[PDB]
Design a protein around this nucleic acid. Structure first.
Lengths: 239, 122, 382
RNA sequence: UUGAGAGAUACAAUUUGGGAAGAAAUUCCCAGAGUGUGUUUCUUUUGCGUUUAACCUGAACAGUCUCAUCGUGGGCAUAUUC
RNA sequence: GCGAUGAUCUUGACCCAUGGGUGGGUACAAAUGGCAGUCUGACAAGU
């Protein structure tokens, strides 16, 4: 028989049950192969005239590739990613995890892919010629006043970098394009900062700098072993 | 060549040529970038040593891409003749691969040099 | 007091500190070249046309104390002859943040739709501009064209044999003499009926010792004779066969300059169709040049090779490289070694044209590779 | 190691916050904190590294010739071994 | 104002209290459909 796919505890993030346990989003530009992935064609059977009822395609989405999926599977109650919002996706580095953000953000949402490297941007524009919601910028991510003309503003911000100066790097963006009570979602990798030392001191000084730049982390946790020595940090700006 | 990164200093270069030379004793070496590419596909390589002054450089650049795909460390070393001369061949080698054994007698030096390379990549 | 930066106009805010969340002035730019050079203007810190216009029009009541966002924009407006005092403190400002919150409310006829579409169309333009190539890195069209060429030849000998089946009623004795499709179509397209045997229409098509056989065939052939309407459909059909015959020539001439466009050194090594079919059967260029040369030397005949790997026999030693003239120039023992050498250099030329420098440089370095192959072939013939 | 400070775990008892039932007493379903006894982790006290403590290297000591590989023929046990 | 110049009768298959669902052929597109893991890897030629 066929599976049933029900929505999870955030809208736009759907879960497949039960002989398959897959975390799926809403496809809106079909025929693709981001990595040669499958697609799931589902519908609700109704009795209507005209056309048969619509098979709203859902595409699978792994925690082994994106930290945001593993943050959903690891346990969460509140999130700033929902259908319709505007997100600033800091760092993409291939353009593969962008399309799942463009799926889950809905058609109303606009995903701004940030990149400063010449090689992966050729796949960013490859994804951008496929889907009508993805705006790529090949811009310096350190200088917000050098891409202010291109972008408008976003509703929340995502930090995929794990750099030792990133407490400045999001700050120049958080002072610039994010509203009050805006959402800040960070994915800090512990061994990408420094590897001679335990992770708890690094996480403590990073959440200290989050308190310094007026970020209020409502929940911070290590994920669970879908990644190794990693944290995703959820905080609100000017709460 | 600005493409040659991460490029090494003197003492680490001497240590890496030494460890390569001892592995070249124990029949535990792969030579030529073609064979090293096959080891990176088959997933048997500890790491990859690539000569930085390889002219033209176009023949080499895919190996670090596939390295960071499979999360396998790598180091550029600034001269090819010391590399292939440290492999026991009287012709230049530009890229070579070290294989994996859970009972090889040179294991600790392999792990220490790997720790140096993971320090270089971060 | 405030210069507004956006790619749809340059707006001075005095709302005409004393502010009222309105506009004092705005001076508009909106086109491809306007937004592209403004996009270069914010990155360069460059003084734009409408910026100097906004310094020229309003003055002495809103521009004596101007706050610019970029500190590079403090120097050029500082040295303006209109004698202005330019500071740049509190650029990060709730009012400056609150400019874009009312930007569809301050620009008449603009909303949140046209800013995003022009922002996307500008992001594609500056994205093609910075990466100095196209948005897709066009290589797929070779994969399309070499998929079309074989089907073109299939329609060609299809309709040629159809014409032979048709015209065999009037004149059956021709196919045993002339067997080529194109010369079969040209003869019927010139002659008409077999009673109209003329010499020059033989001379432009065939060699003479075949032509006399076609003439003596034109005597003794006593096939059926029929009205002119059939002859009209036949010469129409033969015009279509010569038409397609020129058409696939134009398609291969399209594949010529595209193959010399993308991979010049591969083209100098193995011509067009060889590396063309290798790029095709691979799937792309960049997935092909990342491969070992051993997989290159046997890419093609996957199934006989893998069958030999299952049953532990001799693995066959020719992939798709069995058709280039170098491989076809050796004999049974010299041949496979030239093939191994051939992939051993062909991987180098794939990585030549692969990694984004030889594409701009149009190729001079497969020429050495041909010398190294030829000199090995010379000593491998003694 | 014996001292000195902290941490992890289980069993018994104790105690409480939420979801369902009952006037209450009491029961059903999640969550937490206390008391003892066991198991046990980390800093710190002290002995020790005399550095002939270990490892690597050009090694007369692979010479009564050595080693690998495919065969062959016997002994014992019931991916073999001699 | 009927037919051996075919009249008659049957080979779409089933089930249920117009309606409903399977069954098979054709064309189209895609496959966590088929590659233990897409060849071996250091000497040969001459004197």
């Amino acid at each position: 028989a066929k599976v049933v796919i029900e929505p999870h505890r955030h809208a736009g993030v759907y879960i497949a049950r039960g002989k398959e346990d897959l975390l799926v989003t809403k496809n809106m530009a079909p025929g693709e192969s981001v990595y040669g992935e499958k697609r799931i064609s589902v519908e609700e059977p109704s009795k209507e005239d005209g056309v048969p009822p619509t098979k709203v395609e859902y595409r699978v989405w792994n925690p082994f590739r994106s930290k945001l999926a593993a943050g959903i599977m690891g346990g969460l109650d509140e999130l700033f990613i929902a259908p319709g919002k505007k997100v600033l996706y800091l760092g993409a580095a291939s353009g593969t995890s962008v399309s799942h953000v463009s799926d889950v953000v809905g058609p109303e949402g606009v995903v701004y892919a940030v990149e400063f490297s010449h090689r992966p941007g050729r796949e960013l524009i490859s994804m951008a010629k496929k889907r009508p919601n993805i705006i790529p910028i090949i811009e310096d991510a350190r200088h917000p006043q050098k891409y202010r003309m291109l972008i408008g503003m976003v509703d929340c911000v995502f930090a995929d970098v794990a750099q030792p100066d990133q407490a400045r790097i999001i700050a120049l963006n958080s002072h610039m394009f994010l509203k009050d009570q805006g959402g800040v979602v960070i994915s800090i990798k512990a061994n990408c900062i420094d590897s001679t030392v335990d992770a708890e001191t690094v996480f403590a000084r990073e959440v200290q700098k989050l308190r310094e730049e007026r970020i209020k982390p409502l929940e911070q946790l290590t994920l669970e072993p879908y990644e190794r020595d990693h944290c995703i940090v959820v905080g609100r700006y000017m709460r | 060549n600005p493409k040659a990164f991460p490029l090494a200093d003197a003492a680490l270069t001497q240590q890496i040529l030494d460890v390569v030379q001892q592995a070249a004793n124990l029949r535990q070496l792969k030579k030529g970038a073609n064979e090293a590419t096959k080891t990176l596909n088959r997933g048997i390589s500890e790491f990859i040593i690539m000569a930085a002054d390889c002219e033209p450089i176009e023949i080499l650049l895919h190996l670090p891409l596939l390295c960071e795909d499979k999360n396998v460390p790598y180091v550029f070393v600034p001269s090819r003749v010391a590399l292939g001369r440290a492999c026991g061949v009287s012709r230049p080698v530009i890229a070579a691969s070290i294989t994996t054994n859970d009972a090889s007698a040179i294991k600790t030096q392999i792990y220490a040099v790997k720790d140096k390379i993971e320090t270089l990549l971060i | 007091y405030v210069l507004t930066e956006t790619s749809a106009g340059y707006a001075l805010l005095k709302a005409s500190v004393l502010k009222e969340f309105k506009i004092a002035a705005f001076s508009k730019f909106n086109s491809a070249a306007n937004a592209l050079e403004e996009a270069n203007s914010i990155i360069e810190g460059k003084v734009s046309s409408q910026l100097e216009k906004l310094l020229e029009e309003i003055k002495k009541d809103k521009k004596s104390t101007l706050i610019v966002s970029e500190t590079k924009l403090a120097n050029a407006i500082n040295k303006l002859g209109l004698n202005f005092n330019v500071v740049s403190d509190a650029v990060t400002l709730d009012i400056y943040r609150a400019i874009k919150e009312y930007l569809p409310e301050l620009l008449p006829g603009m909303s949140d739709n046209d800013l995003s579409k022009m922002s996307l169309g500008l992001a594609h333009s500056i994205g093609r501009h910075k990466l100095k190539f196209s948005a897709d890195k066009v290589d797929v069209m070779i994969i399309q064209a070499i998929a079309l060429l074989d089907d073109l030849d299939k329609e060609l000998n299809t309709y040629a044999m159809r014409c032979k089946e048709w015209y065999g009623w009037h004149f059956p004795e021709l196919a045993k003499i002339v067997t080529d499709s194109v010369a079969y179509a040209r003869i019927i397209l010139t002659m008409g009926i077999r009673s109209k045997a003329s010499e020059t229409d033989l001379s432009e098509i065939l060699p003479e010792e075949i032509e006399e056989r076609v003439k003596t065939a034109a005597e003794v052939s006593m096939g059926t004779e029929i009205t002119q309407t059939d002859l009209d459909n036949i010469n129409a059909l033969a015009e279509q066969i010569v038409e397609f015959a020129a058409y696939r020539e134009q398609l291969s001439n399209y594949l010529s300059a595209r193959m010399k466009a993308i991979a010049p050194n591969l083209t100098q090594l193995v011509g067009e169709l060889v590396g063309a079919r290798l790029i095709a059967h691979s799937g792309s260029l960049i997935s092909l040049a990342k491969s070992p040369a051993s997989t290159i030397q046997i890419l093609g005949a996957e199934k006989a090779l893998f069958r030999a790997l299952k049953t532990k026999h001799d693995t066959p030693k020719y992939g798709l490289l069995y058709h280039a003239s170098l491989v076809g120039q050796a004999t049974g023992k010299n041949k496979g070694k030239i093939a191994r050498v051939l992939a051993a250099k062909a991987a180098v030329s794939l990585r030549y044209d692969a990694l984004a420098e030889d594409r701009d440089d149009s190729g001079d370095i497969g020429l050495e590779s041909r010398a190294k192959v030829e000199n090995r072939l010379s000593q491998l013939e003694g």
